[PDB]
Design a binder for this molecule. Sequence first.
Ligand SMILES: O=C(O)CNC(=O)C(=O)O
Ligand SMILES: [Mg+2]
Ligand code: NI
Ligand SMILES: [Zn+2]
Length: 331
Amino acid sequence: AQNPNCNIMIFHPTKEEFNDFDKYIAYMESQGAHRAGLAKIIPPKEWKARETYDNISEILIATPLQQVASGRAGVFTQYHKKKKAMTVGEYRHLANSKKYQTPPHQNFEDLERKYWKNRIYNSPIYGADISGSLFDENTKQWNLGHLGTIQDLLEKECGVVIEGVNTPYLYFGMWKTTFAWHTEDMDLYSINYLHLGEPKTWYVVPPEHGQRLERLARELFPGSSRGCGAFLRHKVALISPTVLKENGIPFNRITQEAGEFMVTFPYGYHAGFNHGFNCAEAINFATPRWIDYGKMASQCSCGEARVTFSMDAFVRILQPERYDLWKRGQD
Ligand SMILES: O=C(O)CNC(=O)C(=O)O
Ligand SMILES: [Mg+2]
Ligand code: NI
Ligand SMILES: [Zn+2]
């Protein structure tokens, strides 16, 4: 078995190997990359996402989210308070202000220490889940707005045609902005490209050990657990590496820098934070190996998780027994 310790692997494809996306994901899995739940892909030196980022300030963040924490430094939840619209230019200025900027630090490890120590005492503002793309239409390789769709994958594997579309999202972050512990909708893969700015630190639990994370989460967030049998779908809970180590939960960590891709694999729980002002683009995708994970994915039916139009068909086809109850939660 390849990568039996479930380490995060880093890949360096040649320009030739960067031509066929599906084939390269399949290659990575042949090397055991999926066991970690997360892989880094460094694009060939000849590749670029677009010519420059000079003209992005007029993008609108229609609903910036202030991430308010409750709990203790290592075990907290966050809620999102909606703020008034601002442009990326305005947001970047806010991120760089004395109230919100990255503090002096020695290295990534010192910054990670300061994150876990101090996150709960501040409320950073996140421009998340903005439909759109920063890839140039002429970028042919690993252009997240030109991937084959999940609906076409399901049709090719299962023979059923379904409604729905699949488009990318932009994330504008600042120091301390946080992504809570989650897997993707329907335990899909995700791919994330860090277009510009400061790094993003990731934490991930191997898919084979996801249930260990879920059990700890039920112990640490006991009222949440009673309210819903899949409350990590709400994307609100944070657990520090210290706490995970104290409870013997297997995980790994890695920092993504501008110009690098990360891939999350089906049922790979992940969480993390941004180091300073940045802009990432991400999209879900599927492969044939995903189908069985889709069939087994947990679902939130309490009504909190509220997701996209396209998830309907996935639940309807892959999880027909669940469909009625899940849709009651959606409506
Ligand atoms: O970048 C973020 O804030 C969150 N991204 C992801 O969870 C992802 O790409 O799967
Ligand atoms: Mg613009
Ligand atoms: Ni994710
Ligand atoms: Zn729920």
